Amino acid sequence: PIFLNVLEAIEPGVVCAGHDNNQPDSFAALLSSLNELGERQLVHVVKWAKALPGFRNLHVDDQMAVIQYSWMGLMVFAMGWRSFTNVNSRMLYFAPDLVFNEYRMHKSRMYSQCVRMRHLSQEFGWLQITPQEFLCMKALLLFSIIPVDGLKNQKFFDELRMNYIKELDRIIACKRTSCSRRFYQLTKLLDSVQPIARELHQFTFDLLIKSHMVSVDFPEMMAEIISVQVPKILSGKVKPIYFHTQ
Numbered sequence: 001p002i003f004l005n006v007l008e009a010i011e012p013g014v015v016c017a018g019h020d021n022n023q024p025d026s027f028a029a030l031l032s033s034l035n036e037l038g039e040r041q042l043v044h045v046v047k048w049a050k051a052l053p054g055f056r057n058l059h060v061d062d063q064m065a066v067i068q069y070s071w072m073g074l075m076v077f078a079m080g081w082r083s084f085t086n087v088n089s090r091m092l093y094f095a096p097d098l099v100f101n102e103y104r105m106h107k108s109r110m111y112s113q114c115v116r117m118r119h120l121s122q123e124f125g126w127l128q129i130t131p132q133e134f135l136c137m138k139a140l141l142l143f144s145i146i147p148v149d150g151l152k153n154q155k156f157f158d159e160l161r162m163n164y165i166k167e168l169d170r171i172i173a174c175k176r177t178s179c180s181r182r183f184y185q186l187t188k189l190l191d192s193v194q195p196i197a198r199e200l201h202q203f204t205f206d207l208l209i210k211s212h213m214v215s216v217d218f219p220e221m222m223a224e225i226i227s228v229q230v231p232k233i234l235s236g237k238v239k240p241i242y243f244h245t246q
């Protein structure tokens with residue numbers, strides 16, 4: 001299984017937020033630790049993406065673009081998996097040093113968004129998602145959001161996305177109507193990530209705009225992305241690719 005061998009080999013290790021778990025929880029400190037973790041994760045998502053099979057087939061500009069547009073969804077999806085494996089989805093395992101209990105969901109003022117993320121985490125349990133299905137789904141998620149008017153070289157992208165869908169189907173058939181109900185389940189789960197990412201895009205965008213006054217810090221790399229790429233998505237210029245009607 002050359003494909004799966006590669007996916008495990010390139011999977012990022014643990015990433016820490018650097019949070020002070022000794023301080024009392026507060027809005028500014030929690031959101032500032034999440035933003036720092038987001039910057040750290042982004043660095044890892046780029047190295048991970050660039051090591052994926054066939055990634056260099058994409059035009060150089062298209063490579064960074066798909067990474068910037070899918071960053072949020074990719075973070076949420078992997079965070080949902082970590083929460084599942086580490087705490088059976090009972091809390092949101094953003095990092096070993098930044099685990100959100102219900103009190104933190106509330107103090108971060110991201111309660112409703114955390115509910116949606118924890119629900120996603122529970123679905124890894126309900127559907128009995130295997131670590132290999134998770135790896136394949138997460139790679140495909142990178143190729144699931146594009147400009148309405150297309151990429152610099154859309155044909156290379158369409159071929160790469162087609163191959164990752166086929167690999168997902170393959171890992172399925174290896175042990176299998178059954179396959180079909182399974183492919184249906186996994187594609188529905190992939191789609192469900194998009195609305196969650198859209199809520200988080202709205203939330204981080206609104207926070208960036210008022211960040212001067214709510215004392216929340218945004219590292220340079222993302223503030224760039226949040227003010228330049230995220231608005232393209234929120235204004236409908238860049239849209240997710242759904243398997244099913246929405």
Ligand SMILES: CC[C@]1(O)CC[C@H]2[C@@H]3CCC4=CC(=O)CCC4=C3C=C[C@@]21CC
Pocket residue numbers: 031032034035037038041075076078079093094095200203204207222
């Ligand atoms: C105020 C936190 C916030 O801006 C809002 C939503 C946050 C997302 C939520 C999803 C996520 C999952 C992770 O495993 C790492 C960090 C991570 C974020 C960091 C900062 C963000 C996005 C850049």
